Amino acid sequence: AEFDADVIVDARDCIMGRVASQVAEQALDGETVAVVNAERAVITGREEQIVEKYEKRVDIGNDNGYFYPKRPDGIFKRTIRGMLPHKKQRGREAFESVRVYLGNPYDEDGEVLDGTSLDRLSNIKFVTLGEISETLGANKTW
Amino acid sequence: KPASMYRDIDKPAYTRREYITGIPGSKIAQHKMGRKQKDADDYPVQISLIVEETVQLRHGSLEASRLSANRHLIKELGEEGDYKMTLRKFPHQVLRENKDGMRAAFGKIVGTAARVQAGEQLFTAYCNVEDAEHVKEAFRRAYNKITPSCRIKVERGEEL
Amino acid sequence: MEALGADVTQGLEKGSLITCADNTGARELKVISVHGYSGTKNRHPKAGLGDKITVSVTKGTPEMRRQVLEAVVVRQRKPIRRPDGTRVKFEDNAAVIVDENEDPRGTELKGPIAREVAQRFGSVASAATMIV
Amino acid sequence: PQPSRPRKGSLGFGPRKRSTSETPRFNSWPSDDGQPGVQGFAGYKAGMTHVVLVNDEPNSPREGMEETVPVTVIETPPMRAVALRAYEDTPYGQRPLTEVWTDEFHSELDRTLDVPEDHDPDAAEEQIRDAHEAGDLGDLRLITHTVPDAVPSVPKKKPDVMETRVGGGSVSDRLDHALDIVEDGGEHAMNDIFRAGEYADVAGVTKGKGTQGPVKRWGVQKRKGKHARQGWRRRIGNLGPWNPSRVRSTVPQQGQTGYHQRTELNKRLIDIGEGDEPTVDGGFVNYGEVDGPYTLVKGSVPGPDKRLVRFRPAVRPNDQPRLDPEVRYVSNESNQG
Amino acid sequence: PRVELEIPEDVDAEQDHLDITVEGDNGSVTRRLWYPDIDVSVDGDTVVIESDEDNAKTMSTIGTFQSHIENMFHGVTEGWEYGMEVFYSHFPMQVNVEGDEVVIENFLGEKAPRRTTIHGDTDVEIDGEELTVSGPDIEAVGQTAADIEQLTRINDKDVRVFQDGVYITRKP
RNA sequence: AAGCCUGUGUACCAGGAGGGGAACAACCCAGAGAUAGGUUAAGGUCCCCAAGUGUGGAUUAAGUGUAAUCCUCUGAAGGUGGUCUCGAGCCCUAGACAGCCGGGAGGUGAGCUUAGAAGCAGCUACCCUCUAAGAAAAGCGUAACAGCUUACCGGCCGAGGU
RNA sequence: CUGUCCCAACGUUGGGCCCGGUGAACUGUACAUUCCAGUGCGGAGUCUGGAGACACCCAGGGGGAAGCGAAGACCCUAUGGA
RNA sequence: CGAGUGGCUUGCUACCUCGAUGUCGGUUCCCUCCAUCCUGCCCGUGCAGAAGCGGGCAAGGGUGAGGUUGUUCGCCUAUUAAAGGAGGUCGUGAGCUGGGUUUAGACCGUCGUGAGACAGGUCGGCUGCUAUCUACUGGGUGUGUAGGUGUCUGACAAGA
RNA sequence: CGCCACACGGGGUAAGAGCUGAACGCAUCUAAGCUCGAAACCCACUUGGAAAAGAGACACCGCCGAGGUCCCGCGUACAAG
Ligand SMILES: C=C[C@]1(C)C[C@@H](OC(=O)CSCCN(CC)CC)[C@]2(C)[C@H](C)CC[C@]3(CCC(=O)[C@H]32)[C@@H](C)[C@@H]1O
Ligand SMILES: [Cl-]
Ligand SMILES: [Cl-]
Ligand SMILES: [Cl-]
Ligand SMILES: [Cl-]
Ligand SMILES: [Cl-]
Ligand SMILES: [Cl-]
Ligand SMILES: [Cl-]
Ligand SMILES: [Mg+2]
Ligand SMILES: [Mg+2]
Ligand SMILES: [Mg+2]
Ligand SMILES: [Mg+2]
Ligand SMILES: [Mg+2]
Ligand SMILES: [Mg+2]
Ligand SMILES: [Mg+2]
Ligand SMILES: [Mg+2]
Ligand SMILES: [Mg+2]
Ligand SMILES: [Mg+2]
Ligand SMILES: [Mg+2]
Ligand SMILES: [Mg+2]
Ligand SMILES: [Mg+2]
Ligand SMILES: [Mg+2]
Ligand SMILES: [Mg+2]
Ligand SMILES: [Mg+2]
Ligand SMILES: [Mg+2]
Ligand SMILES: [Mg+2]
Ligand SMILES: [Mg+2]
Ligand code: NA
Ligand code: NA
Ligand code: NA
Ligand code: NA
Ligand code: NA
Ligand code: NA
Ligand code: NA
Ligand code: NA
Ligand code: NA
Ligand code: NA
Ligand code: NA
Ligand code: NA
Ligand code: NA
Ligand code: NA
Ligand code: NA
Ligand code: NA
Ligand code: NA
Ligand code: NA
Ligand code: NA
Ligand SMILES: [Sr+2]
Ligand SMILES: [Sr+2]
Ligand SMILES: [Sr+2]
Ligand SMILES: [Sr+2]
Ligand SMILES: [Sr+2]
Ligand SMILES: [Sr+2]
Ligand SMILES: [Sr+2]
Ligand SMILES: [Sr+2]
Ligand SMILES: [Sr+2]
Ligand SMILES: [Sr+2]
Ligand SMILES: [Sr+2]
Ligand SMILES: [Sr+2]
Ligand SMILES: [Sr+2]
Ligand SMILES: [Sr+2]
Ligand SMILES: [Sr+2]
Ligand SMILES: [Sr+2]
Ligand SMILES: [Sr+2]
Ligand SMILES: [Sr+2]
Ligand SMILES: [Sr+2]
Ligand SMILES: [Sr+2]
Ligand SMILES: [Sr+2]
Ligand SMILES: [Sr+2]
């Protein structure tokens, strides 16, 4: 409920890591970024291998723990954390001022940053984050 | 013993039999195969087996790759076919094996090997035009019993 | 196997000395194995009433002794449970020797039998004296 | 070569800690089939007695014969469905929306709750119908409560409140079915939801055993032989290997046993009746005299005599329903013999 | 490259995104044709499959899309026909069509019926010992025809002795 | 074989900071008084992280790879109609390659061997008519015939093919 | 012959746990909420990378601190002793 | 004949520890590996069926009880669906046992002039410590989230 | 040592059986596409779970009084708590 965002980004057909990297850069500049339509995000490569990597991360853990998100909600939020020094003062404040959403809780449409978008007519080998999440063990709530 | 121990050239030239004693004899029987009465110039084709990597092939690996290689030419062209195969290399490099501990490390004599440089012809066959695809197959079996990857080169033969 | 129509509490173990309720020349029988049973780590293989068990003759006639023959547990000391809730227990623990086709090695069987052994091993029942 | 053996105790009912609510809380509810109704009842455990029956199973050669079956006596007095709750389909799951409450409350319901004096049921009901029109309405559940004051053998008068799902028909016709029970007073007996001979699921918080050791807790071996006299009797071999240089949470250790919530599956209801037919001579041990609405549950039931148990139509049954069994004899003999 | 396909008089094909729907007197077949840099279009009455790239991998699909369109045309004109004949040796096998699924009973003496399912629109009709699978979508027909033969798969024993089951007789 | 033993030349560590290499005596830059401003080196410029989501072009579909050197970063013999670029001989609008159709004939079942063998068990030959083709039969098949094709000719088709 | 075992159960007494009083010691380079990998003199809570991690306290059984305790008795060495 | 993976055996090296990192075998208790003994689904057959043989996928679960021997290993019996193999300081002695190796006592055989010796045998022959830190099993008290009660949700977590 | 309860079915695959299908006019299970297929994977089910720092939602009650604590009598609880 309510988040005063400076920049609002649309993840629709946008290469995950590349978006995350620009969102991370901007978080450190002092911007309140909000990634929208995470379910409709994308990751390039063979579906079978992208799934194996993500399934392994769910199997990984011990008594100490290693919580890895299954929902496409948090998968984007954890990739952003992997580009931010989340264990420093500055890096925590920047990360906490970035929230990822499934769909769009706002009225304003999100922008598509340059270089992030994929051409579906030129590509066939990719996956949707929601397609990864149904394979991980989540409940389709989007 | 695995050829992995003797395939590389790292030991000095140890060939002088007037200093080395108790050397096991060659496992090889024939160096000149086929019809050794006829010349190599009486044949239109000269297809050789070229070694790509600089190795040291043992007399056992030589005998084995000569055997199943010549046995295909005896199988396909008969016991007295119109061919003549040749193994131009000879095993001179005497091998060792330490068999105690590392005290008195100089090993006793176990076998013999031939120093083959890269680009050289180990085997060289001289056949007829129709029997050529049988020899390119006698060499496909011969390179599987030696240590390196090989080239089958036609030195005389624009008949294709 | 075919249901007994009663819940048993396995009253025997492996190495257990039981009686041979027949005329085969076999007096005392010693349990070796329980046909079809697979246990757990650190457990003596338990036998109950109405179990085909592998046995060896302990006491008897010179020709019958030292033989490894199969048998069926006819009687036991530990209470078994009939469907009507009643418990039933016998005087001793006994068994009758049997063959490949599950027919008794003898002709006349000594002492009472249980009505639950009848359903399964009928060829022993149609040779039984008393049935309880 | 170290013989194999399955690990001691289950690793599914973890962690073995004390329960939060003594009142069982379901996490799974039945699928929607036919008629709209409530999906569960609740009562208080009374004790045990045996009952003789006629075998209902057509696959059994005992079909028609007398069979003695053990039965847990549980007093099940009528409950009051005091409210109706709605869930909106948020991307975060099923979050509650609003509740519709009554006017007529129980004289002693203010022993746990802050009883509403001024509530607006009408406009709250409108919000649920607008959410239904929108297409985001999830599952509809009723805030049920018990009447412990109805049971003379239970000292507690402070009502145990719990949520229960309504399902069976279309989302429209069941919202209305729920509202209809609420406007009256919410009075419903076991006859309303359960029929005798059906398979139910009894959920209950087990008997409290305090802190017990590995042998009792995880059923591990006592030290055997010579190893039993050296000063170690009920303590395990080791807490783990050299590396990993940490004790795993999977190793059988000491701790709290009992007072855990369990959901005992496929429990057959043998008879649902009223009066003093299942009561024992001298009364039930540490409970008392049963006279009134009850249920007869086959086998055992989690928890001690006096604790609240919950019923639900079996989510995973194996055998086909064999309604209303021929209950010939119910025992009355004293449990003090 | 570019390949222009002439659509017949009995046929009408419409486009919406990457989806091609072919309508005619035998039915309507909807398909999704997608691959990198290949674009399919309708130039009024001709189907054009064109891509800027000429690599073997692309040429593989341009070719496959042509046969997927050409065969959709035959689907809406004449239709697809697969002929099947039930075979039995000792056991009186019964193959009856029940609802949207073809069922086989008493196969090899089994109490349990072996039932498959009809894929899409496809019509499976029986004339005693014969069976004829027919329809516009070759994808559904060839699969419904296969599903029937494959339903009588026996891996447990020798198929040279146990030859019972429906087989494909006529391939279009 | 060794993060093995033992020489030699040399530089370095030991006794050498600082920079880079994720960490890491000896690998790369670099030899270094204090303070300060500036430009570089090795190395690096999507984020973590200072600097390009830089430019012209091709390849790769395996997450190959994103790993200078290394006990440390593997990967081999063999195999590949995965795919890309290049050259060579030969065939082709006098219609190639493939596919589908048609024809695939008689003297004559070659002869001998043999009770028999008639394209096709074996021995030896391997010959000529009609024609646009058609083997003394190349592969299956039959007790043998028969049957099915294969060489070979014609047609359909239409572009490169091998 | 039997609880040695199958297979563990209940009980008994003194402890153990809470309250008063009394009141030590072993050990302590420093820091120290860890875990998974890696690296390093090749056996790291402390280095690198990640993961995890709100603080304090009670009981516990002892996986780890190559735990504490003892300048290895083994082995070699010393131009050692008996 | 050739090419390799492994790190379970053995061997080599002497980097690590001699101001001590407790042995073997066993036991108890926990996590794991697959190079799969059984169980599931498959391919071939010298696949009629039946019981096999050989191969593929697959580590969820299982793989037990006993006789001799300290034995690991192994031989043996009977059951079984099968009675797989390996890693975790050859898992585990601030858990256990102490039968074997390896003290001081003694005997036999061999050698030795002799003291005495033996990678020959044999009998007897000890197992310390009150847990600071951390680790996990369970149990409380505070703070944060920012007045009280009751009912829930589900990011995640565990299971065979 | 007694007694009670502990799925079926789905979803996606592996090896594998196949369908449509091209590069390669044919053929071809595969290159694009698809139908099936393991005790194995996800779901189902059971247990934990507002400290999830995005530190949650609903209903009511109260902010000068809602509610809690002490206290008292005791257990469905219990080593202190
Ligand atoms: C005696 C040392 C013991 C207790 C045991 C020792 O074993 C030996 O040293 C061989 S002799 C053993 C018997 N010992 C008396 C106990 C003879 C003097 C043994 C197993 C090794 C072989 C040597 C190193 C070690 C510590 C690590 C280890 O495994 C120990 C020493 C330092 C330990 O203190
Ligand atoms: Cl975890
Ligand atoms: Cl950080
Ligand atoms: Cl693509
Ligand atoms: Cl046994
Ligand atoms: Cl023990
Ligand atoms: Cl200098
Ligand atoms: Cl990846
Ligand atoms: Mg044992
Ligand atoms: Mg009683
Ligand atoms: Mg009595
Ligand atoms: Mg068979
Ligand atoms: Mg020095
Ligand atoms: Mg930058
Ligand atoms: Mg790689
Ligand atoms: Mg000494
Ligand atoms: Mg002296
Ligand atoms: Mg010393
Ligand atoms: Mg230690
Ligand atoms: Mg495998
Ligand atoms: Mg496992
Ligand atoms: Mg060990
Ligand atoms: Mg230990
Ligand atoms: Mg000790
Ligand atoms: Mg001994
Ligand atoms: Mg001894
Ligand atoms: Mg101690
Ligand atoms: Na990617
Ligand atoms: Na995880
Ligand atoms: Na020596
Ligand atoms: Na003790
Ligand atoms: Na230890
Ligand atoms: Na120097
Ligand atoms: Na550095
Ligand atoms: Na990679
Ligand atoms: Na006792
Ligand atoms: Na410890
Ligand atoms: Na290796
Ligand atoms: Na080693
Ligand atoms: Na041990
Ligand atoms: Na397994
Ligand atoms: Na043994
Ligand atoms: Na050790
Ligand atoms: Na030990
Ligand atoms: Na000890
Ligand atoms: Na399946
Ligand atoms: Sr940037
Ligand atoms: Sr050398
Ligand atoms: Sr080779
Ligand atoms: Sr072990
Ligand atoms: Sr509930
Ligand atoms: Sr739940
Ligand atoms: Sr002791
Ligand atoms: Sr460690
Ligand atoms: Sr770029
Ligand atoms: Sr290393
Ligand atoms: Sr290669
Ligand atoms: Sr303690
Ligand atoms: Sr594997
Ligand atoms: Sr199998
Ligand atoms: Sr050993
Ligand atoms: Sr042995
Ligand atoms: Sr001893
Ligand atoms: Sr002595
Ligand atoms: Sr000795
Ligand atoms: Sr704070
Ligand atoms: Sr497949
Ligand atoms: Sr909270």
| Distance from Cα A75 to the centre of ligand 28, integer Å | 13
Q: Which of residues 129-168 of E touch strand I (CB under 7 A)?
A: 138-139, 142-143, 145-147, 150, 153
The span from the CA of E100 to the CA of E39, in Å, is 36
CB-CB contact of A130 with A46 (8 Å): no
Between helix A16-29 and helix A72-81 the angle, nearest 10°, is: 60
Tell me which fold the domain D78-188 belongs to: Ribosomal Protein L3; Chain: B; domain 2, (3.30.1430)
Distance of alpha carbon B126 from alpha carbon B121, whole angstroms: 13
| Rounded distance between C-alpha atoms, residue D77 and residue D44, angstroms | 9
Asked if residues C75 and C96 have their Cβ atoms less than 8 Å apart, the reply is: no
Q: Where are the domains of chain D?
A: 1-38+207-257, 39-77+189-206+258-337, 78-188
- Which H helix or E strand runs over B109? strand B108-116
Answer for D224: CB within 7 Å of strand G.
yes
Nucleotide nearest to B146 (CA to C1'): H2
Residue D218 contacts strand G, CB under 7 A = no
Interface probe, candidates A35, A36, A40, A63, chain D, greatest D C-beta count within 10 A: A63
Phi then psi dihedrals of residue D198, to 5 deg: -85, 160
Domain, as residue range, for E11:
1-79
Q: Where are the beta strands (DSSP E) in E45-155?
A: 46-51, 80-87, 94-98, 101-105, 114-115, 123-127, 130-135
C-alpha to C-alpha distances, C76 to C86, C131, D129, E108, nearest whole angstrom: 16, 14, 70, 47
**Which technique?**
X-ray
Distance CA D70, CA D83 (A): 37
CA nearest to nucleotide H87 C1': residue: D243
- CA/C1' separation B99–H71 (Å): 32
**Phi-psi map region of A104: left, alpha, beta (phi>0 left; psi -120 to 50 alpha):** beta
Q: What is the largest CA-CA distance in chain D?
A: 76
Chains that touch A (3 or more CB pairs under 8 A): D, E
Nearest protein residue to H26's C1' (by CA)? D2
Which tokens belong to D103? 């006017």
Name the residue among A35, A8, A31 with its Cα closest to residue A20.
A35
Q: What is the CATH number of the domain that holds B21?
A: 3.90.1170.10
State the residue range of the domain holding B101. Answer: 1-160
Please answer yes or no on whether D89 and A102 come within 8 Å at the CB atom.
Answer: no
Smallest Cα distance from E18 to chain A, Å: 9
CATH class (in words) of the domain with range D1-38+207-257: few secondary structures
Q: For residues B127 and D195, what is the distance between their CA atoms, to the nearest angstrom?
A: 97
Work out the angle between the directed axes of helices A72-81 and A129-136 (0-180°, nearest 10): 110
Contact at CB, C5 and D66, closer than 8 angstroms = no
How far apart, in Å, do the first and last CA atoms of chain C sit? Answer: 21
Residue-number span of the structural domain to which C49 is assigned: 1-132
CATH code of residue C6:
2.40.150.20
Residues in chain E within 8 Å Cβ distance of A124: 34-36
Token digits of residue B128: 């007829």
Do A36 and A104 form a contact (C-beta atoms < 8 A)? yes
Q: Which residue of D has its CA nearest to A105?
A: D91
Structurally, how many domains does chain C consist of? 1
Question: Chain A contacts of E36, Cβ < 8 Å?
Answer: 121-124
CA separation for the pair B147, B61 (Å, rounded): 8
Do D33 and D59 meet the contact criterion of CB atoms below 8 Å apart?
no
Is B83 buried (19+), middle (13-18) or exposed (0-12) by CB count in 10 A?
buried
Backbone angles phi, psi at D127, to 5 degrees: -65, -35
Chain H bases having any atom below 7 Å from a protein CB: 1-4, 11-14, 26-31, 42-44, 47-50, 61-66, 72-73, 77-83, 85-86, 88-89, 91-93, 95-98, 135-140, 148-160
Shortest-distance ligand to the CA of residue D3: 9
Cα separation, D50 vs C85, in Å, equals 9
User: How far is the C-alpha of B123 from the C-alpha of B152, rounded, in Å?
Assistant: 10
Which of the nucleotides in strand G have any atom less than 7 Å away from a protein CB atom?
Answer: 4-9, 34-36, 43, 45, 50-53, 59-65
Instruction: State which residue has its Cα closest to the C1' atom of H77.
Output: C32
Burial C8-35 (b: 16+ CB within 10 A, else e): bebbbebebebbbbbebbbeebebbebe
Say if CB A132 and CB A79 are below 8 A apart.
Answer: no
Report the distance separating Cα C35 and Cα C1, nearest Å. 11
CA of D232 relative to ligand 63 center, distance in Å: 22
Q: Test D92 with A63 for CB contact under 8 angstroms.
A: no
Query: How far, in Å, from the CA of D248 to the mean position of ligand 66?
Result: 32
Q: Which residue is associated with the tokens 């005619």? A: E24
CB contact (8 A) between residue A124 and residue E36: yes
Smallest Cβ distance to A63: which of D91, D92, D248? D248
Gap between the Cα atoms of D335 and D49, Å rounded: 8
Chains that touch C (3 or more CB pairs under 8 A): D
Closest residue, by C-alpha, to the C1' of G66: D242
Output the six-digit token pair for D109. 């319901």
C67 Cβ neighbours under 8 A, 6+ residues apart? C56, C57
E39 to A121: CB separation less than 8 angstroms, yes or no: yes
For chains A and E, having 3+ Cβ pairs within 8 Å is answered yes
Subunits close to D (at least 3 CB pairs below 8 A): A, C
Q: Which nucleotide is nearest to D259 (CA to C1')?
A: I77
**What three-state secondary structure class fits E142?**
helix
C-alpha D32/C-alpha D315 separation (Å) is 11
Q: Let me know whether E93 and E74 are in one domain.
A: no
Which candidate in A44, A118, A120, A121 is best for mutational testing of the E interface (most E CBs within 10 A)? Answer: A121
Which subunits count as partners of chain B given 3+ CB pairs below 8 Å? Answer: none
Q: State which H helix or E strand residue A126 sits in.
A: strand A126-128
Q: Which residues contact A80 (CB under 8 A, 6 or more apart)?
A: A20, A23, A24, A27, A35, A95, A98, A100
Cβ atoms within 10 A of the Cβ of D19, count?
17
Crossing angle of the two packed helices E138-150 and E56-76, in degrees rounded to 10: 90
Question: How many CB pairs below 8 A link A and E?
Answer: 9
| Dihedral angle sign, alpha carbons of residues D10, D12, D18, D24 | negative
d(CA E54, CA A35): 39
Measure E63 CA to ligand 32 centroid, in angstroms: 70
Domain count, chain B: 1
Distance from CA(D145) to C1'(I65), angstroms, rounded: 28
Q: How is the beta sheet containing B45-51 ordered, strand by strand? A: B84-87, B121-127, B45-51, B150-154
Per DSSP, which regions of chain E are E strands?
Answer: 2-6, 12-16, 19-24, 27-32, 38-42, 46-51, 80-87, 94-98, 101-105, 114-115, 123-127, 130-135, 165-170
Q: What's the rounded Cα separation, in Å, for the pair C94 and C71?
A: 10
Domain edge (last residue) among E38, E60, E79? E79
The domains found in chain A, sorted by start residue, are 1-142 (3.90.1180.10)
Question: HEC profile for chain D?
Answer: CCCCCCCCCCCCCCCCCCCCCCCCCCCCCCCCCCCCEECCEEEEEEEEEEEEEEECCCCCCCECCEEEEEEEEEECCCEEEEEEEEEEEECCEEEEEEEEECCCCCCCCCCCCCCCCCCCHHHHHHHHHHHHHHCCEEEEEEEEECCHHHCCCCCCCCCCEEEEEEECCCHHHHHHHHHHHHCCCCEECHHHHCCCCCEEEEEEECCCCCEECHHHHCCCCCCCHHHHCCCCCCCCCCCCCCCCCCCCCCCCCCEECCCCEEEEEEEEEEEEEEECCCCCCCCCCCCCCCCEEEEEEECCCCCCCCCEEEECECCCCCCCCCCCCCCCEECCCCCCC
- Chain C residues bordering chain D (beta-carbon distance below 8 Å): 5, 40-42, 83-85
Q: What is the DSSP letter of B88?
A: -
CA–CA gap between residue D285 and residue E76 (Å, rounded): 81
CA–CA dist D247, D53 (Å, integer): 52
Which helix or strand (DSSP H or E) is residue E139 part of?
Answer: helix E138-150
What's the CA angle centered on D198, arms D194 and D200, to 5 degrees? 75
Residues E108 and E168 in one domain: yes
Residue D155 Cα to ligand 11 middle (Å)? 29
**CB-based burial label for E21 (10 Å; 0-12, 13-18, 19+):** middle
Q: Is the CB of D222 under 7 A from strand I?
A: no
Cα dihedral value B6, B10, B11, B16, nearest 10: 90
Query: What is the rounded CA–CA span in Å between residue B101 and residue E75?
Result: 83
CATH code of residue E28: 3.90.930.12
- DSSP lists the bridge partners of residue D329 as D52
Q: What are phi and psi of D332, to 5 degrees?
A: -125, -5
Residue C2: Cβ within 10 Å count: 8
What is d(CA C121, CA C50) in angstroms, rounded to the nearest whole number? 8
Beta bridge partners of D310: D42, D203
User: What is the spatial distance between Cα D258 and Cα D207, in angstroms, rounded to a whole number?
Assistant: 5
**Counts of helices then strands in chain B (DSSP H, E):** 3, 7
Separation CA D49–CA D73 (nearest Å)? 7
- D278 cis-preceded (ω within 30 degrees of 0): no
Are residues D68 and C83, on separate chains, in Cβ contact within 8 Å? yes
What would the two tokens of residue B54 be? 């600089």
**Distance (Å) of CA D163 to CA D24, D28, D41:** 10, 12, 10
Distance in angstroms (rounded) separating the CA atoms of residues C121 and C74: 10
Instruction: Indicate whether E63 and E100 sit together in one domain.
Output: no
Taking the CB of residue B102, how many other CB atoms lie within 10 A of it? 6
Give the CA dihedral E54, E57, E63, E69, nearest 10 degrees.
Answer: -110
For residue C98, what are its two tokens? Answer: 């049997």
Neighbours of B126 (CB within 10 A): 25
Contact call for residues C11 and C125 (beta carbons, < 8 A):
no
Number of domains comprising chain E: 2
The angle, 0 to 180 degrees and rounded to 10, between the axes of the packed helices A47-59 and A129-136 is 50
- If one counts every other C-beta atom within 10 angstroms of the C-beta of residue C61, the result is 11
Query: Which fold, D39-77+189-206+258-337?
Result: Elongation Factor Tu (Ef-tu); domain 3 (2.40.30)
CB of D91 less than 8 A from some CB of A? yes
Which among C2, C7, C41, C44 is the top mutation candidate for probing chain D, defined by the most D β-carbons within 10 Å of its own β-carbon?
A: C41
D241 Cα: distance to centroid of ligand 63 (angstroms): 26
List the A65 CA – G81 C1' distance (angstroms): 62
Contact list in D for residue C41 (CB cut-off 8 A) is: 3-5
Q: Which residue has the tokens 């969102």?
A: A23
CA distance D256 to D56: 41
